[PDB]
Design a protein around this ligand. Structure first.
Ligand SMILES: Nc1ncnc2c1ncn2[C@@H]1O[C@H](COP(=O)(O)OP(=O)(O)O)[C@@H](O)[C@H]1O
Ligand SMILES: Nc1ncnc2c1ncn2[C@@H]1O[C@H](COP(=O)(O)OP(=O)(O)O)[C@@H](O)[C@H]1O
Ligand SMILES: Nc1ncnc2c1ncn2[C@@H]1O[C@H](COP(=O)(O)OP(=O)(O)O)[C@@H](O)[C@H]1O
Ligand SMILES: Nc1ncnc2c1ncn2[C@@H]1O[C@H](COP(=O)(O)OP(=O)(O)O)[C@@H](O)[C@H]1O
Ligand SMILES: Nc1ncnc2c1ncn2[C@@H]1O[C@H](COP(=O)(O)OP(=O)(O)O)[C@@H](O)[C@H]1O
Ligand SMILES: [Mg+2]
Ligand SMILES: [Mg+2]
Ligand SMILES: [Mg+2]
Ligand SMILES: [Mg+2]
Ligand SMILES: [Mg+2]
Lengths: 370, 370, 370, 370, 370
């Protein structure tokens, strides 16, 4: 009866039933093969470790993400993570409840085809559907009008949606996301005397960026304050026991979202892609899209990103237009919230692709249906 | 008991009961099909949108006019607009009150035949009548003598009417109207750096022409003032937030009414067709037609069109004759005013074509009756 | 008690009571049917228009004269004009006052019979009488001796009358009158660039001939003056506003009265028919008829017609005889003046044909009585 | 030695030498100024285009007729057409061969004066003559007795001619001709959905009337056949590629020749003007004029016009009289045939007005001579 | 003596002398600022790179087009490109030979004014002229009649031209051109696993579209062949060494020329705008415009675009009309060919705007002259 919604993101896998507020299953999407020979005999040494067990034993593992910027690079570990979150995390079978998968727009069709094939052949689900992460994150907002700024761990994409009709010709996609921010933070933290080279360590930098990084109102004056005094510096407690003192890196690595020239990308920052997509949209819907900029994803959780997004957009947009940046306090899981509120809808229950519909169509039904 | 009068114009549909001063229902006559796929599920997405709901959601629609220059191009959307203005706008049934339709002279008989067939078969009205827009606009003037300058959104026509006997052999018809003026304004506004290509945008140009365009007393001196200084330029507030600065376009696009060589037409302007029709009329009625030039329609609402019409006519007419241009302040709906004052007349109540009269006659009773 | 005198002429109907100087009712004798369909509903549109209401609304009517050259062509409109001048113009009933009708000599008996039948059957007058227009126009002169030159709109006739005994064997009749002059003026005005084809327009030419045409003392020298210079040309104010410049047409179309070869008639001019009738008269009354040439009718109102008539007659008559042309200043209505002065006479009151006399006699009493 | 005969008609200019059967030069009499700026440089763009070159390039021109209903409205283009037909069409000089011009009766003297002045001053012809179109069209018939029904493109006139003596007092002139028929066809073709507004298009309607229009034996029964079935409708191949389906318009627009109330004229049809002119003629020549009704002009080329003219005339004329309608198969150029057969006559060679005769007389010799 | 013709297009700058067949100077119109700091010292690092040097060093540059859809967005780089093509490419001075510039119709007057000001103030040319690209591309065809389908890199416009007189009221302009096709190809190539985000890469997609894209005879059957088998797929050699396998994208992105709904535009495809402009033209020139559809520009170089244009036009045009699509093998530079054949014309040598003419007129002489 109930439906499963599985937000297979690049950094986290939010999986839970339909009709509830919060996702019950949340864990990093990495698999870890044992790095060392393992002299001790017995104790249940396994070939792989998924999620929290990998996070706890990350010292002797070699963590890696199966999903790049949205595309699934490796498939065996992806279906392994799916089997894990289905059996060892939710303790349910896929043959009973329909599953709901999410993806980013401007996605290779091979990824969706392999998703459908894996879901229908290995697990044999009665029905499923492949929605868009940004559209669901807009559902969670309760409204139907406004452009969505969805930026997760691997991809940042924006799609403007009017009063039910979205604009596919203005869908912008930026490969700059949280993983690139973590890489830039690792690259700029070596200038302080802290080398993070290995994948296992990189997670420490990820947590440091998650709980110590913020976006400045403006770059120049915050640098001037960084240059003068240590009033800005703050210390962190490392798992090994040492302490580090980061200064301008607290707001320099989040600035890459607005100035991609730091990691080398030529793409316009997240504050300019939205304005360019709205300027590519229709001239009557711009008044409604300017005052509705729905943000989602874990990357939009920095303290002060909403204020800078606002300021930049009213700097780009005309003065008479008013800019509003909807910053929900549960925007980290807004995609899952939208999927769960979508799965309970009665009108949507008819457009699930079913096995009986899938047999004659093959793995190509997903493009024509979704 | 009461009778419905429905001025199914090319740009607006003025619909209301009989015996009242103002039409209660006024909205643009366009239907809009959804342009984009519509990813959001639910919320009441419809196949079409008529009138003000189309004007509000014109961003995602593709607006189009079912009526060209007076002829009804598409019939399904026309009867859809009729059903809309009957049920969702007036909340009345056509089976009870008789309806009154209007049309322009020199009209194809197929249009009137299809009008009668749709009104008698789909709605099954007890009685109806097809009058002429200019004759009704003259009724609204309270007088019976004078030529009528009726120019709406699709057609401009002139018919001289004496003390009850009109002259059908002098009925002039000009395909130049407000839609052509809007097209010319769109064509000449690209020279300033503002491209309006799509139908939805074109409505913005229509409102700009409605509330920023005027007709000059003479073209040459106003151009000389346009050439020298910006004393003439005025800014406009666009819905997107931007501002535009129009100069000579304020009086260049309304000049097409008097110089059709701008949009390419070879027809004499609205100031020469009236004089040629009066010169085609009888030699004793010219003295009464020269001093009575009743104007109507929304196109005759430009500031200064009455003065230029006067000046041009006394330039064409002999000097001893005096020219008067009746410019009523409610000439935008003068056709509807005349229809409503006509429907209350007791003598007219006998010449409605009824269903019992329509059965044996077929759809050809309208030509012999009206 | 009082008696009605009704001069039912070809161009005008002079109707009034007896014993007064001027006729109170004067209007053109034409009926006008509506030419156009008449789209406007109501306002009192009528089937016909008689007299001044037809003259005012002549633009949309098709005027026509019921009386040709003296004979009544159509009878329904004639009795309609009679009913009009009796009820809507004089506001009196024919059943009370006796009516007096006039006619031209050498008239078909059917016309007088139908006149008597209409007056006695439709209106039921107590008494009536059918006199001769020229005899009454001679009464108005106060004298009893002299030939009468009566020329109205349709017929020109001359009857010499001695000291009470008229000569019926010398009654000449010429079908050349004002209508033929108007037709000739219309035919010769097209050579200047002014086309008058329709009946309504023709009235404008009639007024132009009434107030701009004169008869020359001699044709040759006036042509020589017309040929040289524009000293003769004069302009006219048309009702439409235009102006025309007529030259030799001011005295060419009135010359038809003396040279009938212009409109094609073979009849001797009005200056030769009088001389031929006097030469057909008795040899002792010629001395009294030569010095008494009473003129009447509206056609004899041209400036200079009296002088030319004189000159022509003394050119035809012997030198020892003296020629006099009585040109009264009220000769336009001289027939009505004579009828009114005749109706007051006591001796005439006995010879009215009465209904009681009419019953047994039928419509043939008029020939034996009058 | 040879003489030029130039029938400067309202729609066509038939020009050729004398003594031959057919006119070598035939082309429409219109001049066309270039309507558009003409971006292409070179190629021989000219200020005007006359005749067939205007007909071929009528798309970018604005055609107009210098001759109205017989009067020459504009003189510069008229003398331009004369110079064209003299030099670029016949390749002859006017100084050598005498020219013969034609005109309609009841013509303004200014037109003939300007004709003579242009022919004697600009071209300096040795001699010329201004004849009448109907008299020449009667010459072409080989007989001398009979009334002529000459109806071209601008004027329809009738003049009865006996055994050498014509009757100028019975010359009727009707302004209804082929141009008015084309205008009526354009006005009544808009009821089928085909709008012809511009002058260039109007020529297409002219050809449609020339090769698809006929006159019915009677109006009522042909309408009854038009009302029932499409057995009457016929399609036409437009130059643009489209096809049209005309029904009752094939015989409705030619009916205007007999019922002028369609275009609004009050004049009696061509079947009543002839009878009224014959009834205005002499009573002994009516027997010879009834059996001789010579028709000419291009307007008399409709299939069935002869039969309807016959039927109408024997309906108007007495029964004992026999009516004959001479319908020659070359009546389209009968005026030119008569001019050419007239120019070869030896007796006519003496009455040409010569330059030596023209010097002292001025431009007024034409009225006294012709 | 010789004249310079400079086709400053949106994607390429064809510059060469007059009187020769091929343009000697051809290079992309982009400027590239150095993206990276440039650690190496010396070697001639420059602030900008224009044309082929930018194409060779595009890896470290950020290419951008100064011309949008025809309008010049940035002026400093535009005059820089002009100075480059004048000095570093042709090695000539502008002060000696007159220059000829081209532009698209329906162009903002500010662009032409700035063009004239830059050419007369910075370079001080003796004379110049601003022609239209489509008119020149028609000159290159050697004929004068036919509509031109000019579609370059930024704008597609159509102007019908008759035998020297063009029709400015039927000039259609479509903002869909090769740049939009390249953007659509980049958007649809991400579905195969190849992300092109940066401007430098986009040139690789441009070359892929130039040498691997074709237009199908019909969309449906070619999709059916694309769906079934890889018989359609073809590989490409990337500069980095990798190979790509494109399938339906070979004919899907060129279909945008006929179905603008792919990139979101509401404009009718290039096959419908031509038919709508011809239907807006005159009815006599349609027969000559249907059989003459001159194509030009680099976008019209796809294999099979001529056949599809033909088929679509005979599908829209009537059947009796014959459609011809002139597809010249040098239509990529047809505008330059026409400019060069135009500059050698003797008649055109008089209408160059000169400095002495420019002084008193200011930068506004270009509108009144060209
Ligand atoms: N409190 C926080 N502040 C800043 N960044 C955060 C915070 N929490 C998570 N993130 C970043 O957001 C990313 C998670 O993205 P997520 O929303 O899970 O993407 P997806 O929905 O595609 O799985 C992490 O990589 C982390 O770097
Ligand atoms: N205030 C105004 N000034 C100038 N033009 C106007 C104004 N209001 C309306 N119009 C023009 O008049 C047109 C409406 O014509 P309308 O009178 O409704 O025709 P119809 O009676 O046939 O419906 C509109 O297209 C608009 O361009
Ligand atoms: N002032 C005038 N000068 C010249 N002609 C006139 C004048 N007034 C009237 N007429 C002519 O006289 C005619 C009127 O004739 P009228 O005497 O009324 O005849 P009847 O007595 O038979 O009615 C008119 O047709 C008009 O043409
Ligand atoms: N075959 C035809 N059938 C009917 N009408 C025709 C035909 N040919 C020509 N006409 C009409 O006749 C007119 C030509 O008149 P025409 O005899 O040339 O007058 P004119 O002699 O004064 O030049 C044209 O306008 C055309 O409408
Ligand atoms: N062989 C080809 N096949 C398809 N498209 C081409 C080819 N060559 C060039 N193009 C396209 O044509 C465009 C060049 O347009 P061009 O004719 O130079 O415009 P302009 O004349 O305005 O400079 C390029 O952007 C390219 O995409
Ligand atoms: Mg995400
Ligand atoms: Mg209207
Ligand atoms: Mg009288
Ligand atoms: Mg003729
Ligand atoms: Mg180009």
């Amino acid at each position: 009866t109930t439906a499963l919604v599985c937000d297979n993101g690049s950094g986290l896998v939010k999986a839970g039933f339909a009709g509830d507020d919060a996702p019950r299953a949340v864990f990093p999407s990495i698999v870890g093969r044992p790095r060392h020979q393992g002299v001790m005999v017995g104790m249940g040494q396994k070939d792989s470790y998924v999620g929290d067990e990998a996070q706890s034993k990350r010292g002797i593992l070699t963590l890696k993400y199966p999903i790049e910027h949205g595309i699934i690079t490796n498939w065996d570990d992806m279906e392994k993570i799916w089997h894990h979150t289905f059996y060892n995390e939710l303790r349910v079978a896929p043959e009973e409840h329909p599953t709901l998968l999410t993806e980013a727009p401007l996605n290779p069709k091979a990824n969706r085809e392999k998703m459908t094939q894996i879901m229908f052949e290995t697990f044999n689900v009665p029905a499923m559907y492949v929605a868009i992460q940004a559209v669901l994150s807009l559902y969670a907002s309760g409204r139907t009008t406004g452009i969505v700024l969805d930026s997760g761990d691997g991809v940042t994409h924006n799609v403007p949606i009017y009063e039910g009709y979205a604009l596919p010709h203005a869908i912008m996609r930026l490969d700059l996301a949280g993983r690139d921010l973590t890489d830039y933070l690792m690259k700029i933290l070596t200038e302080r005397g802290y080398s993070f080279v290995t994948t296992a360590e990189r997670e420490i930098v990820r947590d440091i960026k998650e709980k110590l990084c913020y976006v400045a109102l403006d770059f120049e004056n915050e640098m001037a304050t960084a240059a003068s005094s240590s009033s800005l510096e703050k210390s962190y407690e490392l798992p090994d026991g040492q302490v580090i003192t980061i200064g301008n890196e607290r707001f320099r690595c989040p600035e890459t979202l607005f100035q991609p020239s730091f990691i080398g990308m030529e793409s316009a920052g997240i504050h300019e892609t939205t304005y360019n997509s709205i300027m590519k949209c229709d001239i009557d819907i711009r008044k409604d899209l300017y005052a509705n900029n729905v943000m989602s994803g874990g990357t939009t959780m920095y303290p002060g990103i909403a204020d800078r997004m606002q300021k930049e957009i009213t700097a780009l947009a005309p003065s008479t237009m008013k800019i509003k940046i909807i910053a929900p306090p549960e925007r980290k899981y807004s995609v899952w919230i939208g999927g769960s509120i979508l799965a309970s809808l009665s009108t949507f229950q008819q457009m699930w692709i079913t096995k009986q519909e899938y047999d004659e169509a093959g793995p190509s039904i997903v493009h024509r249906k979704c």
